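#struct-pred
JK: can someone run the complex with bromide ion? inputs below
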Amino acid sequence: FYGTVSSPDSGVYEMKIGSIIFQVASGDITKEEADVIVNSTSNSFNLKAGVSKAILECAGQNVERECSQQAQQRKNDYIITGGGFLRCKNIIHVIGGNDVKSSVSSVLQECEKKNYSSICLPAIGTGNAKQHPDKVAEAIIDAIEDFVQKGSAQSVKKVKVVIFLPQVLDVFYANMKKREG
Ligand SMILES: [Br-]
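RT: done, structure tokens with the ligand placed:
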């Protein structure tokens, strides 16, 4: 499945995984444009610390309210809200403590269901949940491999991880180089 790691733009690394362009970069995810932006939050969908703070503050109070409304309704493994004032069509709020491969698989499936092309996510779990960056990287990329292997990638064309700490970026880079053709 794996293509070659290159750097298309300063500080960005990319490689193909099947038909998907997988990219990683460091920086502030709230500045990104994508069909879906992922928020890594708590099981109450109301964390406002680290990247979740930035996402909820930029997205706005209407998204905060959509989150607590759905959180009240049933036990969710993740929730989908509007994008608020972020540059996306939907935010998918996943639980940072949850199995990362499972969370990314869910995000990919939801994006196919909406015929979306682009996804931007953080290094899910490496914030408040304190999952280890190496395991998180392995899980994210494994989820994308499985999705491609199953023939499920149709609308999804671009998956970008925008990562708050350059040191975590370095871990993702190493993982891509491990996998490259
Ligand atoms: Br991150």
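RT: quick notes.
Helices lie at 51-59, 61-73, 100-113, 133-149, 166-179.
The pocket of bromide ion is lined by residues 51, 122-123, 126, 163-164 (CB under 6 Å).
JK: thanks, will look after standup
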